[PDB]
Amino acid sequence: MRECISIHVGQAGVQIGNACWELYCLEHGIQPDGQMPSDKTIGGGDDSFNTFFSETGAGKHVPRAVFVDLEPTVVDEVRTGTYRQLFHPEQLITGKEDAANNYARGHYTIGKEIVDLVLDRIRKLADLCTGLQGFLIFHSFGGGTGSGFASLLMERLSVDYGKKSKLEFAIYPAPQVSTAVVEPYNSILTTHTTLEHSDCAFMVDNEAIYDICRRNLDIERPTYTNLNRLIGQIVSSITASLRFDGALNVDLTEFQTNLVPYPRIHFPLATYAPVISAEKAYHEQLSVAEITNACFEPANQMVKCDPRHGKYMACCMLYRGDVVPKDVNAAIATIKTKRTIQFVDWCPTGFKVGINYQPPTVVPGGDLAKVQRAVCMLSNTTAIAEAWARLDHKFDLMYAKRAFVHWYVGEGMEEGEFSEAREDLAALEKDYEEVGVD
């Protein structure tokens, strides 16, 4: 039917997978024991919940996700957590050794012995699934593990499955923070190994994730609990159409078709507009015009790329909750009439809209609000070339000073690839200004 396969590749992946599945159990009320209250839902697993769970004749929902890790500690703790007996035992594949922040160590010396097992899990899910619409791959760019292994996995899964779609969600380098000196290396490695098979990859910046918290949510000391909750509700908004009903519907396939103009560039930015606390929600008014102004306001975007430094190119907005289309189209009219947002001249029309009736969901004791109207925006721009421009002016320095290269050559890597990665990246920037110029 309709379903997606979840691939949490990464130590940072299990973070967000744990959080987003904590969300995913609430909206259908999946008890941490595995079965519903007195009310009846069990059967072949035929309702909206099938698209994630297989609550087969055993009556227990199956998490259609696979968790891969390279340090036993965090996976061990999460299975010593609460939702353990909900999880499947050997969907939690954990190694015994670390990539040592080294993309090459992750890629060559360590990657080989696990790919067989991981493909085994994927195919023994693929046999029982029907639609095979897509995967949700989550890794981390600066992943001291998650960096490399994910890339080679993408390689082999693309070559053995050449038809279906791939959505990547990866926390990005920070502009002024690199908590790993190896981050500016593995970033270029992963980029020039993944641009050519990754279907659509999305990024976001942790620093601005922090900033928004005390810009509007008023959180001086947030944590991962908060951050992961945010990203989880992001993906919940994006798959709301997949799960629930509404007036008109769209799918990840439509996202792929509409959003990405050219090969290469498929890197839009996402913003969730109605992030605000309960005190604001209670005696403060919510409506379409102000939420749209919030979404297109530059600062609220969690990536330090001023849109005025660039030009909006494509735009997809999904509205969720009790909303009507009149104000929606009037708002898009006011938006297009405003001049400051200088659109690329190519497409006169650049707006894909998707409406779902079902309101979003809070978690008790959480941080979000008892919302009625919500909008998620994902739009692709040209205002982002500055980030990789920033990456190069330091990668050049460090490779010219050949610092740490002893590490990679000792583990068994050479440098022709390190050379060609920079031309791949230069190609992406030059294509960016080429497409920007009209």
């Binding site: 996976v75 061990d76 010593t80 035992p89 015994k96």
Partner: protein, 91 residues
Amino acid sequence: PNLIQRKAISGYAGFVPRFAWVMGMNYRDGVTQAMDDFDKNQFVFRHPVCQGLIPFYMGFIPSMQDNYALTFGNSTRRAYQKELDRRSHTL
């Protein structure tokens, strides 16, 4: 502590006590009784500060062959009780 204090998660990359003493059996029962008597003895540990054997058996129980003139069955059960009586040296 550890809830589901009966089995902590099949495929425990972390290790468990009672790999020794009583092991050679599977995860669940071993780990749960491990932790159970483990914690119990720790607590104390932290207390104050101050009829009818069938024929053709091989294996000699006392006497037997000296006495005779019956069937294997009756004779053997006879010895079965009298090994509580006079050749009571069996245990």
